[PDB]
Design an enzyme around this catalytic site. Structure first.
Site, short mmCIF file in Angstrom:
data_model
loop_
_atom_site.label_atom_id
_atom_site.label_comp_id
_atom_site.label_asym_id
_atom_site.label_seq_id
_atom_site.Cartn_x
_atom_site.Cartn_y
_atom_site.Cartn_z
N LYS E 11 2.54 -7.72 3.33
CA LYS E 11 3.97 -7.49 3.42
C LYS E 11 4.57 -8.39 4.51
O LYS E 11 3.84 -9.01 5.28
CB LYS E 11 4.22 -6.01 3.67
CG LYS E 11 3.76 -5.12 2.51
CD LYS E 11 3.97 -3.64 2.78
CE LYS E 11 3.56 -2.81 1.57
NZ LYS E 11 3.55 -1.35 1.86
N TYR E 51 8.20 -1.18 -7.10
CA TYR E 51 8.25 0.19 -6.58
C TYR E 51 9.08 1.11 -7.47
O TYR E 51 9.68 2.07 -6.97
CB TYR E 51 8.79 0.18 -5.15
CG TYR E 51 7.82 -0.34 -4.13
CD1 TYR E 51 6.51 0.14 -4.08
CD2 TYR E 51 8.19 -1.30 -3.20
CE1 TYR E 51 5.61 -0.33 -3.15
CE2 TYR E 51 7.30 -1.78 -2.26
CZ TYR E 51 6.01 -1.29 -2.24
OH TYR E 51 5.12 -1.76 -1.30
N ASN E 114 3.36 -0.90 7.24
CA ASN E 114 1.93 -0.76 7.06
C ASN E 114 1.27 -2.03 6.53
O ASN E 114 0.18 -1.97 5.94
CB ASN E 114 1.63 0.43 6.14
CG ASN E 114 2.19 0.25 4.75
OD1 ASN E 114 3.00 -0.64 4.50
ND2 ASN E 114 1.77 1.10 3.83
N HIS E 117 -0.22 -3.96 0.89
CA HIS E 117 -0.14 -3.12 -0.29
C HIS E 117 -1.39 -3.32 -1.14
O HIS E 117 -1.93 -4.42 -1.24
CB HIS E 117 1.09 -3.43 -1.16
CG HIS E 117 0.97 -2.92 -2.56
ND1 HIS E 117 1.28 -1.63 -2.91
CD2 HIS E 117 0.53 -3.52 -3.69
CE1 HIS E 117 1.06 -1.46 -4.20
NE2 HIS E 117 0.60 -2.59 -4.70
N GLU E 128 0.84 -4.51 -12.04
CA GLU E 128 1.30 -5.26 -10.89
C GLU E 128 0.86 -6.72 -10.97
O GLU E 128 1.64 -7.63 -10.64
CB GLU E 128 0.79 -4.61 -9.60
CG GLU E 128 1.35 -3.21 -9.37
CD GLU E 128 0.74 -2.51 -8.17
OE1 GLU E 128 -0.21 -3.05 -7.57
OE2 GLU E 128 1.21 -1.40 -7.82
O1 UDP Z 1 7.24 7.89 3.49
C1 UDP Z 1 6.94 6.76 3.07
C2 UDP Z 1 5.94 6.48 2.08
C3 UDP Z 1 5.70 5.21 1.72
N1 UDP Z 1 6.40 4.15 2.25
C4 UDP Z 1 6.12 2.76 1.84
O2 UDP Z 1 6.08 2.71 0.43
C5 UDP Z 1 4.83 2.12 0.00
C6 UDP Z 1 4.43 2.71 -1.33
O3 UDP Z 1 4.00 4.07 -1.13
P1 UDP Z 1 2.87 4.72 -2.02
O4 UDP Z 1 3.18 6.17 -2.11
O5 UDP Z 1 2.71 3.97 -3.34
O6 UDP Z 1 1.52 4.49 -1.20
P2 UDP Z 1 0.49 3.29 -1.34
O7 UDP Z 1 0.16 3.29 -2.83
O8 UDP Z 1 1.33 2.07 -0.96
O9 UDP Z 1 -0.71 3.48 -0.47
C7 UDP Z 1 3.87 2.39 1.14
O10 UDP Z 1 2.80 1.45 1.16
C8 UDP Z 1 4.78 2.24 2.37
O11 UDP Z 1 4.90 0.89 2.80
C9 UDP Z 1 7.38 4.34 3.21
O12 UDP Z 1 8.02 3.42 3.71
N2 UDP Z 1 7.60 5.65 3.56
#
Ligand code: UDP
Ligand code: UDP
Ligand code: UDP
Ligand code: UDP
Ligand code: UDP
Ligand code: UDP
Ligand code: MG
Ligand code: MG
Lengths: 154, 153, 155, 154, 153, 154
Positions: E11, E51, E114, E117, E128
């Site tokens: 990211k 997303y 974080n 991805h 994806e």
């Molecule tokens: O409360 C939250 C949860 C998720 N995210 C962001 O949205 C992405 C997608 O979330 P997901 O639930 O798909 O988790 P992941 O599959 O990315 O581990 C995450 O990687 C975070 O960068 C965020 O900003 N806030």
């Protein structure tokens, strides 16, 4: 839980003697935490016993104090969100035998009485330990250039 | 209790993939002492004796064949609880269930290609050390930082 | 032509073992593309050490040099690769760490010439002599790296 | 050359901002030098003008002092045989453009006005800079456990 | 099974903080094969499309604007159980729940920052991958150490 | 001015096969240069022969082209002050046997025909190589959060 939480991290004399100052600092640096205070010190026995006052009745206390006096200590204040709890996670379990590889103690330490480093266990104890080890003017005020890339909020 | 020893071997895939240095550094940085090491391609009888527990398993001949397919870095490491903690440093036997930060969690994928071996018990370690090493190949020495790694024993 | 099966003798001296540099030193040779064909942790007798340094028996540092080589374990190694003798010496750095460049082993880890952590054969002929002195021939392992054709354009 | 020679090493504000505290310390830690004093400081401008007194008439003096005031500085005293000269070698050329990879500036820096670190250029300048940046009780006396493995003599 | 593919992206915060090398090395050292990679600043519609499953939850518009705020290093990695092990390598989605040794456990703090991805399922990975890469951007090759990483295909 | 100078860096198939993508990127990342374009690509023979056009009469030409076809290539554009010349210094001497430890070829390579990486030898050749390997839209324009700490001026 704001981004200006602070914790007291110390590199114990075994960590200094075994050449772990750089790698321990890099562990907190790479995580995104901010160093606001640091000094190499050989503090007097009174300060060390005050630091461990809540353990003054445990049987390892006299040996722990004597070992904490046996060499220099790198005392630090790190600032960041949840830096107290996450800092403890980075150090690993107090006893290195129960520590996981990837943490400080899981990579470098074996004996609980030679566990290389110290980290405040609570927000309240962090403030007390910071005041015990540092003068207020030893904490430097600055803002990291990558603050907005480490944190989504204040 | 700090003179406990364990047998650590870098399997042929770990040697082929250039993991000798990183694996040795894992044990060196942790504070354990290297008392014996040699790069060997041992005879098949020694390998079958090493895996004697699995001689009836279906994968035994294939495991023995792969353990013969390249050099092995055989080591003895010394330190308190080195057997149990050595296993933790290596990670789960199947790398798919291992945590990143361990050897297998950083470098390995297949259980049949998990790059390293570690004794699973003090008693098994004593057997494996005697199997792989002559007594004169264990080097007695005292680390300069022994009193900074250990508080006792 | 200088072939890919040239061999040299690399040893981690007792100070390198004591200071926890076994892993790092081996990695420098692993990462470069050289092949480890022999290795053992050994505590050799003084006669073997005086033979290894026979050409310096009259130098003023010889007595302490031999004694310091006896003060701890040595990690003895044979590495195989094209120009491994000369390039090995370059990786170790100048014999005196004061004149060594950072990025080499001595330029990263050592200070005193009497505590320069490692040893490397200085010639192809002296490499063959040192390999026979330190290793039995059946301790040299014959094998082929899976990345040989990506490290070497020619035999 | 005695093994108790000392030099002053500073991590400039760009080195602190770019997360190079750990890596720079490890360079001197791994070489065998001994850290006898360290602190994170935001020194007053008069100390900085005195540190660079030789350049007080140069045209970039005011810009140099201002950039040295722009962030925290990690000030260190390292001890070892020929630590002043070898320390400058570890840092690399003052201009990172002329520095070799494997040195600190050859690995991390590009501009001479952002060369991340400072090192004393002579023994007597080290003594002068140590006295300027550190109180005498901030230098900690201790003996490294591996001293006899780093050094063949005093 | 060793040809499973996942989509890994660095990211903008990971790119900005200079973590491109360390993250690639994490997958490289595990034994996975990089078959596609490009530095890209995708259009907003593609990010909203990526997303889309979280389109009506909170933090959505902030997530899209932040994914637009800098370059993204998009990658396709290939290997056995690369989708699940890839997520384990990244660490828990919220870095405060991640373990040291993982990417987020070593480098990140805020869940909105974080760093990386990873696809959470084999079927979501294929979507994806198709969303982020043209088919000709996936390069076909065989690692020289394939048989030392894998005991079988 | 010159802080936006650009060069073409490529990780050759041997570098990709030996798992050196991460380490090589980290060398340029850590130095302070900005990655503005990157892709894993398997280019056709005509593009490789045009890249090495000035070497079509050297005897090692045919073997060079076929080896550059034998695997994936990681093509990159890096941006920074004097990145062309400093890039070459980071890669090390063309023949790894003449390279200094601490450079890429000094740490990872042996044979000149397997020297792991490529770097533009001049500003003018970088522009031609960048246009040859990348479309203009593959170059991403962005501003590093630590730009003002890496450079003192544009
Ligand atoms: O409360 C939250 C949860 C998720 N995210 C962001 O949205 C992405 C997608 O979330 P997901 O639930 O798909 O988790 P992941 O599959 O990315 O581990 C995450 O990687 C975070 O960068 C965020 O900003 N806030
Ligand atoms: O049985 C014990 C428990 C603790 N300690 C030491 O005492 C310190 C403080 O103990 P505490 O319970 O506060 O654990 P911590 O907060 O340090 O994780 C530890 O870090 C150890 O170095 C020890 O030597 N023996
Ligand atoms: O299904 C299996 C189980 C084990 N092994 C190999 O056999 C060794 C011995 O397995 P063991 O049960 O003794 O576990 P370990 O003691 O090696 O942790 C393992 O390390 C693997 O290399 C294998 O190839 N396939
Ligand atoms: O003045 C000197 C020269 C050499 N040595 C040591 O003795 C070895 C002699 O090796 P030589 O002079 O042949 O150079 P080298 O081949 O080790 O570079 C050196 O490596 C050092 O360990 C020493 O202690 N003092
Ligand atoms: O043209 C110049 C020369 C020097 N400096 C800065 O001033 C410091 C002091 O320069 P000096 O000549 O003392 O070199 P040093 O002793 O630091 O290597 C350097 O480190 C640079 O940070 C600068 O910004 N521009
Ligand atoms: O005798 C030679 C000279 C060069 N090369 C390869 O072909 C490239 C030719 O590039 P050049 O001679 O312009 O030097 P470079 O610009 O790569 O430093 C080198 O990088 C090597 O990878 C080779 O295989 N044999
Ligand atoms: Mg406590
Ligand atoms: Mg000689």
């Amino acid at each position: 839980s704001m981004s200006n939480e602070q914790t007291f991290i110390a590199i114990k004399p075994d960590g200094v003697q075994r050449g772990l100052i750089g790698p321990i600092i890099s562990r907190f640096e790479n995580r995104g935490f901010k160093l606001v205070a640091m000094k190499l010190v050989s503090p007097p026995q009174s300060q060390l016993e005050q630091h461990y006052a809540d353990l003054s009745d445990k049987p390892f206390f006299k040996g722990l104090v004597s070992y904490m006096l046996s060499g220099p200590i790198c005392a630090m204040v790190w600032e960041g969100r949840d830096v107290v709890k996450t800092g403890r996670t980075i150090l690993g379990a107090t006893n290195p035998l129960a520590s996981a590889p990837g943490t400080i103690r899981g990579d470098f330490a074996i004996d609980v009485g030679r566990n290389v480093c110290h980290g405040s266990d609570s927000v309240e104890n962090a403030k007390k330990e910071i005041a015990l080890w540092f003068k207020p003017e030893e904490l430097i005020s600055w803002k990291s250039a990558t603050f907005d890339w480490v944190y989504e909020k204040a």
